[PDB]
Amino acid sequence: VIRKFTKKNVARAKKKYTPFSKRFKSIAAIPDLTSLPEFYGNSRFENKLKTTQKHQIVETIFSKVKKQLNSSYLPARENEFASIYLSAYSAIESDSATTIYVAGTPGVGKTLTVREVVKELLSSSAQREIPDFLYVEINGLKMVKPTDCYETLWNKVSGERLTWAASMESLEFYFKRVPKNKKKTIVVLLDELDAMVTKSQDIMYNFFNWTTYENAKLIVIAVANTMDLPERQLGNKITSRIGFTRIMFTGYTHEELKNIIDLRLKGLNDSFFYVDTKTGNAILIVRKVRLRMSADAIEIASRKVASVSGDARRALKVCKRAAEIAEKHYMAKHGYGYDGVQTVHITHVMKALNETLNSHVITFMTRLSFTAKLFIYALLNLMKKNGSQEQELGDIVDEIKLLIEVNGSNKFVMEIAKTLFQQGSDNISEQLRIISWDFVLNQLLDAGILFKQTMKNDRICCVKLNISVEEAKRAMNEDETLRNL
Amino acid sequence: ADAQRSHYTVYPSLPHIPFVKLLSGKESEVNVEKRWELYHQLHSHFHDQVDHIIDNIEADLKAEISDLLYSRCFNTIFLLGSDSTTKIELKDESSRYNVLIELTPKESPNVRMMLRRSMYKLYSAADAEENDVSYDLSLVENFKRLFGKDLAMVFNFKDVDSINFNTLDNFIILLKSAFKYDHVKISLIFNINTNLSNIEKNLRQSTIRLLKRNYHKLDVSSNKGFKYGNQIFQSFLDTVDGKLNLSDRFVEFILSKMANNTNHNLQLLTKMLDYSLMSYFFQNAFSVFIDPVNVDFLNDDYLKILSRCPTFMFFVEGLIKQHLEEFFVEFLVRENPINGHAKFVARFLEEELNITNFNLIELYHNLLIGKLDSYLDRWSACKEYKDRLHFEPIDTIFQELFTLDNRSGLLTQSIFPSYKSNIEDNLLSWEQVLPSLSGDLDKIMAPVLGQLFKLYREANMTINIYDFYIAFRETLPKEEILNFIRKDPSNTKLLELAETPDAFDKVALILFMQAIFAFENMGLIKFQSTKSYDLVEKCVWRGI
Amino acid sequence: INCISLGEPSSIFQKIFDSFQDGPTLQIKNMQHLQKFLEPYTFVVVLDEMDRLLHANTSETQSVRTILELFLLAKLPTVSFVLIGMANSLDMLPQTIVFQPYTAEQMYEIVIQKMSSLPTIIFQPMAIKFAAKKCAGNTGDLRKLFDVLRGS
DNA sequence: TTTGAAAAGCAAGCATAAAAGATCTAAACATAAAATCTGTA
DNA sequence: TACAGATTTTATGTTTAGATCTTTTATGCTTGCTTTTCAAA
């Protein structure tokens, strides 16, 4: 049989097709799923990334500081914690199904608070004030396909591996028809909810409609970017089912960020270390060296980050970058390689904060060649005369030619005109483009300085500035030649 | 409701020939059955020869295509006037596989699809005669390594006038790349329906220089030299020889309608002859008298309607100036040798004078009137044989009772009607359609479509719809309309709407608007807006 | 039959068929097979969330395509078919029943009757009336009232 | 034989239909591995 | 029970038919002005 095409790279999962609704004779024949071995969850890759170390690696004084400020390793989230814990505890205790909506900007401690609520609920269930529950965590951005959530949650409930439609009907039958005394409470965290939004909103409606079912015993904690995500991207059914009591995670104030950073650096700030002067390795309790990071530097970093975002990740990274800058200067001045008072100062914090604020666009255009600068200058002249914000490339060609032939008494132009139009050579004819014309055009397109229209006619194709005009002029005002003309 | 659906199948209930009784219902059923059987024995006798002519022209076209095809470049054959219906069969050359690849403009949206379809067809044919490959021109490269034999590809391009010529051009330069392989022979067949000057101006000059190295024109059609046509006409004449006559107006109508169709004139000729035979065996009660078996039941109605004949009246006027049923039987044994005369003249033109480009239908026309000499004067080779080839058209009494004629306009109403003009004359006149026999309203009030078409015709190219409504409203009697709408007292809402003083302004407006949307559905009017309905413009003018 | 759990809107007839039989299993891909299945015999299907049955990215006509095939078979003689189609108005001939959004007194009656099972009413009555009045008007949702009382 | 006067032609300007195509999607057509259903055995 | 084959399910790739929106260009209405034959004297 001769095949019209071949699919020779098919990788099919071993997932079954029969849903949960057809594996028992009736509703009254379903056994107690709590007393089942595969149901409700009743790591093999960790050995593969281990090797033998044959060098004693030198950890300086700032190494413990930089390891301390990592996001992987709650003074300011106590009302959000109380609200989420009260709602989840009341839904677990009363065998109720509910939705808890949480939204906020990045890094304001939403996932951390939800996980701490879940850990405290598990601690409460361990000592038997609430019935036992299953915890499922589904991130919408960690799914290859959005329907994989259907494959994930059911696999966490029954231990079976099914396809997504069969998993969806299995979850529907489990939430609607299975009695509450026969099942267990399930708390599901939906993280990055905007990634679970499809064109038809099947998954959103299903997940928030299962919470309206009597027998479901399902608690859905939905974590999102904004308050008005259902009112913008979801229908009125899903917006009605999510509810009206929505939990805001506002950005941190500077006191809260300062308290977070001080609670990180609680045991190592204003402390003493044993440091070997020949190598630089530091041991917490040969010179006794006193480590401090100043509270004024942390304070103003907290004030700047809190004014910008309120992001705890940004504040921790600014402090870690300041520690990295101080450690780089320390290892430079002490001659320390890789195998009395050390202070992370305020100037390091201000160097860390300004490094993402300095703009390399003007610095990049300042160090370009003369022909790229001449291109930019001629484009600025065309934008000055005809005022279009989009100039044809042939107009730029004729404006470059005009600027060369008018300032023909300028000494630099007299020295460089043969370079632009003959590459400094006899036996090379007078060219219609300058030397490195498409080179600087593609260079400015690669940098994102310009936008070029997709046309095959080189003259009437238009080119637009992608950056602001005053920084381009500023960069043109630094040069000694283009200032004169 | 199945009328509100797209397609529904119904099975009728059930509790046998379509021929009717003639002679105002006086004809017997045995004459009807005999006329049915005689129509079928002439119809089958004609269409068997038509089938043998169609099989012969297909076989001869296959033979000449094979002869041109088999006698580092393409072998190009331009079939001019080709309708892309030929089956091109290829011989089994030893140690080499010959593959036919056919390409449709629907199958050619771009060059990539052309190559992929061609290479799938090639691989399917090669596997069907003798692991899979990529459907790509590298299969032509490795054809001997994968199949052992070498290759001969014949490309047949169906309907080249409708293809995108840039895509075809790029496919030709793409196929040109297979010339560097030693085991590859490529032939191209272009089915051209217009002429070669249209296709030489759409291809590039390098493509023309590529195709010029080995190319053959072949002008094969139905009008090529009139051979196939004249055979169908001679088959029809041999079917009706000794029984039926062809009128000169019928033959000239055949020539006129066959002049207006060029690509498919043969089956048009068969269609007109078929409908003429159907008309004769449906109309004439004397159709049973074309054979001498059925002359034993001529009744008084037959003798009544054979006495209303111009030829018989001329004959008896000549006899009373000079000086019945047995005498009518006496006019059946005669030969009427005009068909044998026409086939003898055709044979004398064909195999004595070597003249093939003659139209036997127009020759039969000139033989029917008697202007054969003016038709034979054109060749300048029958100057000394014209007297023997000429014979006078004989006049036979009761010829028009056995005659395919065209005097009533039937054959130009069923096969080539003036469709738009028929719609216009039905809409404008309207008393020629509906019978003149709501008893008072039908004699004073026109139908709404016919009444609207008058003001449609007498207005201008752009019509304001409200003034057109007013001009419709002035043509309607309001008192008689209100009297007719009060005729039925069993409808309460009609009576409560009629006594309202603006009832006529409702009634005339809604009849006007249902006629306006009827006109829009027929395509007479259109709207010069999409969001507005305030002005119409008309698209249909009478008489064109 | 809830319609979000359907894969394709054109499969609803099969979902109608599988909801009634045990036996034989025949492929239903149009309403004609459903009509000849229900022809020798009544049957009530309740199509909830039927607004999913409209086809996306399809011209008006083809979008309404399946739904009137759901409805015109409900207007055929000698078939035993009853269709009750519950749909949300905000998201979008048969007989139409409309459910008007609740007012404050209806919400008060619902709240008192619904916690009539409880021994002691923890809410004040004027608080419930204030919550019902604030959750009223156009798009009056009882879920919003329940969320307001739970939040209180 | 004129004669004025209404039908018709030309031009500029602006609102607007319409062509051309960029972008995208549904559906027909096509393949394919795992699960599931028959079907004897 | 039980295994081999047939069919279904789920999943993905290929190609065609068609919808929708955007942009540039043609066209038609409006107003003013000038040419040119036409019914009447």
Ligand SMILES: Nc1ncnc2c1ncn2[C@@H]1O[C@H](COP(=O)(O)OP(=O)(O)OP(=O)(O)O)[C@@H](O)[C@H]1O
């Ligand atoms: N209240 C807090 N106390 C201490 N550390 C915190 C606090 N909030 C946030 N952090 C730190 O910030 C990191 C990021 O927080 P988290 O992952 O909870 O953010 P998020 O609000 O869910 O943001 P995103 O929308 O990007 O997912 C945490 O891993 C932790 O290191």
Ligand SMILES: [Mg+2]
């Ligand atoms: Mg998070």
